[PDB]
Structure 1
């Protein structure tokens, strides 16, 4: 007999558990708002060859952004909700060549997760997260499990690797899944309009692996590479990312610094372990900008 959390509760105990467990989520989220006044791991400066932990954000949508050369740059919104680091995995047992950290975001219901998953967060003292991503790091950057991660971890002018599951399209055919040309409509052509043509040759008595034939579109993890941050809203935790991000609106992404050789070495000015708001030195404004962006509130741009 499959159960759920709310199977035997009366109408007098349904609002209590709705209030109490959500207050437990808000208490543990507000107990973890001080990384530096707790005991952290040591801070190290940036070195050539060092990598940094990323974030998990939600894609709100896009608004247009205009630059001082007078061209429109579409910018997607990448809003970071409740980003905490959950686990550290060392150099020796990481099954790779870089070490890793695990980070989760989008706190979800504690009633709708497996008991093996819930014992992880119950040790940490955190609400359970929706999606857990693993970031390759070096040993220079190592952050204790439990610190919050904010939007000002990144900075404007920084190029960013973003990946998520793309919009699934179900079982699709030929001219939509792979963009082939198909057959003409009229001039004979009785039942061939969106049909795959020849698959292989005659001497091949089979079909090769990896041939393009109808199957399920989308719902795979794709990465877009080299996307500039133009702007950061610190108040609502917004990353303003250039172009389009894989996935639908209100979806969870993986926000990593770029892999591109020209765009992966320039990391001197970036705050290296994370960004810590408890440092209390030069508190960041409402909105951090790039050089080329137009300020909403700056006057009309005159090119003379």
Structure 2
């Protein structure tokens, strides 16, 4: 269960052998192990992977002790990877081979208080004959006296986006260890700078 952190740096397109392929560019810098939690010490297997460096003054938090507990440069962010205890003290882009497919989770862009139509791509309403009151309007929502209420989770407008989205089976394109870079099949959640994770997909 391979797992390494990184951030979306941007995306252009390359040329495979004689065909064009849009690809996204992630950056998987060294992620220092911080806490290999075993089932004995917790109940599940995992690894705390750090990331970006830090002004030692900002991390005056007890984090100092946690860092020193493993003896590592104060990173900025660190998360876990379920069922994954590899080796050494650091993971890298060497983990992924050009051909393996990966799952990347990210934080979708926040579309604020988005309208029903924008949100769940509804139909809206007549722009012509109908009263200029319900153009982008959910219209009906329920029934008469029975049931009298609204089905919980009924698609309605509101703050939408800026959440956890997982795209799957993106094939690992050309990976350049020379700079801790990683190329994937393009469509990746999150803006250009969001903290994303890259794991191992489930084809079989």
- TM-score, normalized by length of structure 2? 0.89
Q: Which residue of 1 aligns with 2:104?
A: 162
Q: Secondary structure of 2:14's match?
A: strand
**Structure having greater relative contact order (Cα 8 Å, sep ≥ 6):** 2
For 2:91 and 2:167, the matched residues in 1 are separated by: 22
For 1:109 and 1:207, the matched residues in 2 are separated by: 51
User: Which blocks of at least 5 consecutive residues in structure 1 are unaligned?
Assistant: 1-50, 262-304
User: Which blocks of at least 5 consecutive residues in structure 2 are unaligned?
Assistant: none
For 1:208 and 1:84, the matched residues in 2 are separated by: 47
For 1:180 and 1:128, the matched residues in 2 are separated by: 47
Q: Which residue of 2 aligns with 1:91?
A: 39
Pair 1:226 & 2:175 matched: no
For 1:166 and 1:129, the matched residues in 2 are separated by: 24
Quote how far apart the aligned CAs of 1:122 are. 3.2
In our comparison, the structure showing a higher alpha carbon Rg is 1
What is the CA RMSD across the aligned residues, in angstroms?
2.0
Quote how far apart the aligned CAs of 1:260 are. 2.5
Q: Secondary structure of 2:13's match?
A: strand
For 2:192 and 2:130, the matched residues in 1 are separated by: 44
For 1:176 and 1:62, the matched residues in 2 are separated by: 25
Contact conserved, 2:31 with 2:91, CA < 8 A, in 1?
A: yes
For 1:223 and 1:188, the matched residues in 2 are separated by: 40
**Alignment partner of 1:71 out of 19, 34, 59:** 19
For 2:176 and 2:57, the matched residues in 1 are separated by: 32
Q: Secondary structure of 2:69's match?
A: helix
For 2:167 and 2:42, the matched residues in 1 are separated by: 25
For 1:72 and 1:207, the matched residues in 2 are separated by: 49
Contact conserved, 1:231 with 1:240, CA < 8 A, in 2?
A: yes
Contact conserved, 2:31 with 2:51, CA < 8 A, in 1?
A: yes
Q: Secondary structure of 2:148's match?
A: coil
**Alignment partner of 2:160 out of 203, 214, 217:** 217
- TM-score, normalized by length of structure 1? 0.62
Contact conserved, 2:29 with 2:93, CA < 8 A, in 1?
A: no
| Pair 1:211–1:162, CA change in 2 (3 A) | same
Quote how far apart the aligned CAs of 1:222 are. 0.9
For 2:175 and 2:162, the matched residues in 1 are separated by: 29
| Pair 1:104–1:201, CA change in 2 (3 A) | farther
